[PDB]
Amino acid sequence: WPKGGLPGILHHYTETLVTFEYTTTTTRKPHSLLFVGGLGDGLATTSYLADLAHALQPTEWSLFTLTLTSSYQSWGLGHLDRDTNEIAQCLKYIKEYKTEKFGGSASSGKIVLMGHSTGSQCVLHYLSRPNPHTHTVERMPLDGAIMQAPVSDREAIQWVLAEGLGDRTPAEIRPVFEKLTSMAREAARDADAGTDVLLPLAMTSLVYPAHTPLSARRFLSLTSPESPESPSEDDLFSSDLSDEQLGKTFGMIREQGLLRGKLMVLFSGADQSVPAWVDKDTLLSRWRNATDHNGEAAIWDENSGIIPNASHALSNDDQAEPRNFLVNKVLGYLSALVKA
Amino acid sequence: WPKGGLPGILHHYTETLVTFEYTTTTTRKPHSLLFVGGLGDGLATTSYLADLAHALQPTEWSLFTLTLTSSYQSGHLDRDTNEIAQCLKYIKEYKTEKFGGSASSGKIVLMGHSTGSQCVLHYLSRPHVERMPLDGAIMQAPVSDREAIQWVLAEGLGDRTPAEIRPVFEKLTSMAREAATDVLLPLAMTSLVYPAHTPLSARRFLSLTSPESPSEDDLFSSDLSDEQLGKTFGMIREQGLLRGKLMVLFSGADQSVPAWVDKDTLLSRWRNATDHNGEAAIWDENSGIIPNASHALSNDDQAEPRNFLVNKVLGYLSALV
Numbered sequence: 001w002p003k004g005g006l007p008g009i010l011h012h013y014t015e016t017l018v019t020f021e022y023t024t025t026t027t028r029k030p031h032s033l034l035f036v037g038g039l040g041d042g043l044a045t046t047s048y049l050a051d052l053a054h055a056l057q058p059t060e061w062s063l064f065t066l067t068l069t070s071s072y073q074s075w076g077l078g079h080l081d082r083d084t085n086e087i088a089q090c091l092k093y094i095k096e097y098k099t100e101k102f103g104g105s106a107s108s109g110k111i112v113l114m115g116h117s118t119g120s121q122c123v124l125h126y127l128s129r130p131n132p133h134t135h136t137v138e139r140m141p142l143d144g145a146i147m148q149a150p151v152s153d154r155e156a157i158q159w160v161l162a163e164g165l166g167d168r169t170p171a172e173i174r175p176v177f178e179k180l181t182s183m184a185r186e187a188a189r190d191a192d193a194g195t196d197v198l199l200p201l202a203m204t205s206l207v208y209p210a211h212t213p214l215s216a217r218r219f220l221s222l223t224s225p226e227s228p229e230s231p232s233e234d235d236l237f238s239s240d241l242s243d244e245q246l247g248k249t250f251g252m253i254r255e256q257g258l259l260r261g262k263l264m265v266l267f268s269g270a271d272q273s274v275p276a277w278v279d280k281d282t283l284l285s286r287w288r289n290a291t292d293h294n295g296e297a298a299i300w301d302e303n304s305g306i307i308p309n310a311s312h313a314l315s316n317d318d319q320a321e322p323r324n325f326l327v328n329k330v331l332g333y334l335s336a337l338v339k340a
Numbered sequence: 341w342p343k344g345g346l347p348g349i350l351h352h353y354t355e356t357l358v359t360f361e362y363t364t365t366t367t368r369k370p371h372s373l374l375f376v377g378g379l380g381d382g383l384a385t386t387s388y389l390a391d392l393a394h395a396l397q398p399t400e401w402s403l404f405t406l407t408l409t410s411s412y413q414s415g416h417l418d419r420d421t422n423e424i425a426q427c428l429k430y431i432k433e434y435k436t437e438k439f440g441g442s443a444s445s446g447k448i449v450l451m452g453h454s455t456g457s458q459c460v461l462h463y464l465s466r467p468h469v470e471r472m473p474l475d476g477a478i479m480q481a482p483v484s485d486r487e488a489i490q491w492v493l494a495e496g497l498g499d500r501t502p503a504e505i506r507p508v509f510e511k512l513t514s515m516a517r518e519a520a521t522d523v524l525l526p527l528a529m530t531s532l533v534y535p536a537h538t539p540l541s542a543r544r545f546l547s548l549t550s551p552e553s554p555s556e557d558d559l560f561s562s563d564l565s566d567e568q569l570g571k572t573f574g575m576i577r578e579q580g581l582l583r584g585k586l587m588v589l590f591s592g593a594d595q596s597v598p599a600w601v602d603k604d605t606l607l608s609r610w611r612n613a614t615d616h617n618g619e620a621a622i623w624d625e626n627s628g629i630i631p632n633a634s635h636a637l638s639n640d641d642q643a644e645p646r647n648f649l650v651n652k653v654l655g656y657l658s659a660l661v
Contacts, residue, residue: 004438005351010360012341018384020360024637040412043350043383044358072379072412101344192515194526195542213413215524335539 001263002050013093017086018043019066022053028064030102031110031338032094033330036087036119040074040212041045042067045116047313055327061112061334066090075198077218080125080233087126088139095140096323110337112144112261114330117313118210120150124236127259128252144261144337148313151273152238153222156209159275168206176203181223187216209273209312239278246290254297262301263291264333266326268310276312282307342390349406353430358383358424360405362393364499369402370439370446371430373657375405376424377540378455379414383407387453387636388646394652401449404431414538417462417556424450424459425469432472446659449476449584451653454635455536457482458559464582465575476584476660478653481591482636484561486548488535488596500532508532513549516542535596535635562601566613573613577620586614587624587656589649591633603629626652 009021021285023029033056035046053063068086070079078292091111092286098109117124131139161177164170180203187197196215204214207220221232231241236249253259265287268278272279284304291300307329310322349361360383363369373396383405391404408423415640419513428448435446452460452591457479464477493509496502508529518544530545531537540548547555553563559572565625576582588610590603597603614623630637630652633645 001352004351004434005361007347007349009345009347010350011345012384015341015386016380016384021345042358042407042412043360044352044356044407046352046355067384072414074412097344116658191523192518194529195515195519196524197543198522198524200521 002044006050006053011093011097013090014086017067017069017090019064019090021093022056022063022065024057027057027060028102028106029060030098030108031059031334032064032098033061033063033112033114033334034064034066034087034090034094034121035114035116037065038117038119038210038212039070039079039121040210041116041119042071047116047315048326050054051323052140052330055331056078059331059334060338061194064094075213075215075218076196077215077221078233081129082119082141083122084126084129085137088137091140096107110143111140112146112334112337113142114146114148115150116148117151118153118234120147120235121236123147124150124249124253125299127256127263128249129256131256139258141258141260144333145259145263146266146333147263147325148266149268149271149273150237151271151312152235152263153208153210154226154232154235155238155275155278156273157207157222159273160207160209162275165206165209173206175183177207177223180204180207181218184216184219184223188220191216194218230238239283243286243290246286250287250290253291253299254293259299262302263299263304264327264329265304265307268312268314269306269308269320270310271312273312301333303329326327341386342394346390346393348393351430351434352425353406353427353586357407357409357426359403359404359427359430361404362396364397367398367400368439369400370444371399371401371448371657371661372404372435372436373401373449373451373653374404374406374424374428374431375451375453376456376459377409377453378536378537379411379522381454381456381636382411382519385453385636387638388642388649389428391646391650392653395654399657400661404472405608405652411432412633415556417458418466419468420459421463421471422469424463425471428472428474429469444661447475448472449478449657449660450474451478452482454483458557461572461576463558464586465572465579467575467579471581473583476587476656477582478587478589478656480589480649481594481633482560482588483594483596483635485534485536486553486558487561487598489533489548489599491596491598492533492535494598497532497535507534509549512545516549519543544571562598562606566609569609569613573610574616576614576622576641582622584660585624585656586622586627587652588627589652591635591637592629592631592645593633594635596635603618626656628652 011019013019056063068083070083082106113123191197197221199214201213205211219235288300307322307326314323351359353359364613406427408420410420414566425460450460460477460479523542525545527539530540611623630645630648637646
């Protein structure tokens with residue numbers, strides 16, 4: 001969005017997939033921040049990314065964004081495993097690239113994975129899931145991990161059905177939601193194996209804040225009842241998940257050994273996607289206690305919190321001050337990482 | 341892809357769509373080449389894009405590549421057309437602000453790569469952002485998807501023989517008829533028969549496999565009539581969105597074109613449709629066949645065909661100025 005575009009380097013970490021490095025200068029950049037946008041974003045995330053790149057100019061960190069297969073196939077369920085593999089491939093590339101370019105020590109360069117919106121799912125999934133060594137793509141450990149506005153899509157839809165979305169009131173959205181579920185359930189039962197029934201964009205965008213296309217199977221994941229015993233792949237950040245369930249995700253960060261550093265969560269204080277019935281402070285403390293195993297570890301970054309007056313994506317002209325604050329928290333996190 | 345990536349500028353031509361500009365600050369860049377393709381032929385393509393970008397560095401042309409809505413997804417040609425028009429509008433404004441407007445004599449060329457060639461012809465010949473006129477147009481490896489599938493069914497694809505492909509093709513037919521509320525077919529099965537290797541809706545697969553012989557995609561089939569070519573190549577003059585000339589570049593060893601297609605006759609017929617049998621002079625005389633070129637010119641053995649292709653583009657752009 002800055003006039004004249006943003007200068008940088010377009011890399012190929014696979015033959016099909018790319019990562020864009022933001023850079024204007026000769027300066028040394030041994031360290032790397034890989035930013036993972038929302039599902040279906042690719043390199044097209046805006047929000048605070050320009051301000052972050054501008055702020056990282058004087059530093060020893062260069063900002064990366066990337067494309068995944070899920071950037072192009074944003075409508076399918078069961079996507080986080082593939083996302084995670086491609087992030088790992090991108091991290092491997094960045095690590096060799098930064099060694100080759102600036103030399104120094106082989107593993108001097110530090111890597112931080114930042115998730116934005118539903119990109120935060122990829123961050124937690126990267127850290128929490130099994131890391132097998134199967135040969136028929138090992139994930140490297142991160143020096144840091146950030147999740148910006150990790151919000152439940154399930155609970156966001158509940159809030160849309162309660163309050164409305166845009167011009168549309170609850171009474172107008174409801175008939176479409178009920179029709180969409182009925183369509184999605186019918187497709188799950190009746191569609192041929194391997195096919196995906198894409199639901200109408202006209203209908204889904206009335207109920208879905210992300211405004212990305214939806215298959216029947218993917219939509220069902222977002223609306224079917226979360227089981228008190230277990231939720232879906234996407235449903236990592238719902239406020240009514242049990243401590244047992246948080247132990248399977250946040251609690252597995254310590255066990256997998258892929259974060260040799262801190263996890264910082266940055267909630268948005270005026271996040272319009274989060275229901276007013278959700279206590280955000282309780283939610284962060286429960287994630288902290290799950291992550292730290294009730295004081296046994298110190299993985300959770302205490303500097304995690306709720307950005308005052310920030311919206312979900314911090315998009316507005318209103319959001320100049322929260323954006324600047326958010327960017328300053330990222331630079332402070334990154335500064336603490338390089339000070340020993 | 342080159343060691344250390346390739347430097348440039350990432351632009352947002354809409355809120356959600358982007359175009360990457362290959363450029364350096366050492367030379368001014370009043371002129372612009374917009375390079376278009378489907379998923380795999382666009383912003384994230386390999387092909388000959390690195391060679392083209394490097395070759396334009398000393399010139400007054402910068403190279404743009406873009407994401408469409410159809411790049412994400414993989415009626416689509418009207419949407420493609422609109423998004424190319426939006427990107428061209430952005431490029432023109434950007435380059436006007438940077439290097440001056442009509443007094444600087446800035447030029448815009450639209451280049452279609454593989455699947456992007458359909459978008460180039462549709463942009464030019466179809467009768468919502470209003471489409472701007474182009475100073476030039478290039479179509480590289482324009483191929484019939486219909487005849488590419490026919491060729492796969494006759495000769496196989498990859499490690500599959502036609503015998504191995506036929507049960508997959510028949511199942512996809514059976515899966516598609518049952519579907520015909522948009523239904524995507526299994527990508528692991530459609531990629532066995534479809535050379536472009538992108539997801540197909542059930543209607544699109546039936547459109548490509550059913551012989552009307554024509555859907556809106558079917559622009560470059562060799563068995564299309566002169567009357568049907570008049571509606572596409574013939575409408576370039578009448579729409580008035582091409583100021584300069586149309587250069588078409590076939591790949592000599594294109595594996596997706598059937599061996600039986602007479603490429604020389606196909607160039608003669610497109611030329612005659614484009615120029616209306618000598619009434620107009622729109623067809624570029626440097627159009628032709630690149631010797632030994634594969635569809636994408638991607639392999640390590642394609643250095644010579646890539647050089648040939650790049651020089652055709654450089655000479656075309658040089659002539660335009």
